[PDB]
Amino acid sequence: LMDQPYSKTDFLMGTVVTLKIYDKGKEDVLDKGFDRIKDLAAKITTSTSEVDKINEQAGKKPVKVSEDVYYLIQEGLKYSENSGGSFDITIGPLTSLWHIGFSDARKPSQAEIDAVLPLINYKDVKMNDKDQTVYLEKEGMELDLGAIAKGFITDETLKVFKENKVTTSIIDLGGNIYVQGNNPNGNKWNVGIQDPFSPRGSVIGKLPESNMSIVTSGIYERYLEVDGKTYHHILDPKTGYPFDNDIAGVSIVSKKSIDGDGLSTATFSKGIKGGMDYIEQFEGVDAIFISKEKKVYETSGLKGQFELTDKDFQMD
Ligand SMILES: Nc1ncnc2c1ncn2[C@@H]1O[C@H](COP(=O)(O)OP(=O)(O)OP(=O)(O)O)[C@@H](O)[C@H]1O
Numbered sequence: 001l002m003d004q005p006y007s008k009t010d011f012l013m014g015t016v017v018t019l020k021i022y023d024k025g026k027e028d029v030l031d032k033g034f035d036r037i038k039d040l041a042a043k044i045t046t047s048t049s050e051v052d053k054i055n056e057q058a059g060k061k062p063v064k065v066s067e068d069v070y071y072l073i074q075e076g077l078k079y080s081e082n083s084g085g086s087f088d089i090t091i092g093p094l095t096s097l098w099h100i101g102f103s104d105a106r107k108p109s110q111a112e113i114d115a116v117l118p119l120i121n122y123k124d125v126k127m128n129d130k131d132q133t134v135y136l137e138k139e140g141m142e143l144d145l146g147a148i149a150k151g152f153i154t155d156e157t158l159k160v161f162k163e164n165k166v167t168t169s170i171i172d173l174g175g176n177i178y179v180q181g182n183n184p185n186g187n188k189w190n191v192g193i194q195d196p197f198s199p200r201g202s203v204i205g206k207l208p209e210s211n212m213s214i215v216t217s218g219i220y221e222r223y224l225e226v227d228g229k230t231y232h233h234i235l236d237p238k239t240g241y242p243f244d245n246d247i248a249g250v251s252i253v254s255k256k257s258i259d260g261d262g263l264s265t266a267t268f269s270k271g272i273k274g275g276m277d278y279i280e281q282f283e284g285v286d287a288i289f290i291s292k293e294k295k296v297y298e299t300s301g302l303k304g305q306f307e308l309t310d311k312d313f314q315m316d
């Protein structure tokens with residue numbers, strides 16, 4: 001293992017992506033990782049991808065998809081059902097309307113919202129295993145896989161690393177982290193817990209981890225502000241507006257990055273106390289929640305592990 005890793009940085013899917021590999025002789029795996037990231041991003045992004053092709057044929061015909069996309073949609077339907085539909089991969093018509101985080105983000109009229117709410121229904125995604133097709137049952141429906149895309153891609157990048165016998169690495173997609181192995185000095189990696197009140201990279205504390213995903217989500221990262229009100233990017237498919245509760249941010253610790261990514265989006269529907277109860281139901285998944293008044297909460301699996309360092313915040 002090297003003390004200084006091989007490192008490469010790119011800007012993909014709207015975010016800074018850095019991969020680091022500490023195994024000597026594995027420098028070319030960085031390009032293999034980035035190749036896989038670019039491959040997947042092109043298939044699933046709606047910003048003509050495979051997801052675009054499914055959407056174009058909604059209510060018309062099933063669309064053939066590659067194995068990557070069939071799998072991601074399969075998993076998205078599970079996160080959708082498990083959340084009671086508060087997470088819904090058919091939220092596309094609504095997230096396309098607001099377009100939060102893009103230069104043309106807009107608060108739509110209530111009429112525009114009422115026109116898209118009847119289109120949101122994960123049960124109207126029809127999957128055919130033998131043909132490997134996806135069909136949206138109603139015209140106007142749109143898939144949006146954005147709430148699990150980065151986690152899935154992180155998991156698939158790790159798969160490439162392991163296929164190349166990488167043992168010790170850090171995968172960073174815009175502040176969402178997977179740490180493989182341990183620090184070359186033998187200690188567990190000290191993983192920052194993101195400060196939702198500051199840009200990605202600023203932290204409120206640290207958590208030692210090894211072979212683990214630590215994702216982060218915060219409502220102040222890319223919101224639209226208009227006429228004195230703010231609208232963040234995590235939308236309620238039952239109302240058409242962003243979730244409105246006490247969560248400012250949440251970090252989820254789990255073995256698989258896609259689980260952290262999907263469950264984070266799902267917990268935003270439940271608030272801090274309800275979201276903690278939800279995470280206490282998933283074995284091997286834990287969370288740090290941060291309220292709008294800078295109180296910090298930890299689920300049972302993290303007590304005594306997380307160290308709060310920012311004095312502007314308080315454990316509660
Ligand atoms: N209720 C929802 N169900 C499913 N997908 C959603 C929902 N609300 C928003 N999305 C889509 O998921 C995208 C990413 O949301 P997610 O909650 O994963 O962001 P994040 O984790 O806070 O940010 P980042 O991915 O940059 O770290 C949104 O931009 C939107 O396209």
Ligand SMILES: [Mg+2]
Nearest residue numbers: 146147150261
């Ligand atoms: Mg995400």
Ligand SMILES: [Mg+2]
Nearest residue numbers: 176215216217
């Ligand atoms: Mg995230």
Ligand SMILES: [Mg+2]
Nearest residue numbers: 147261262265
């Ligand atoms: Mg997510």
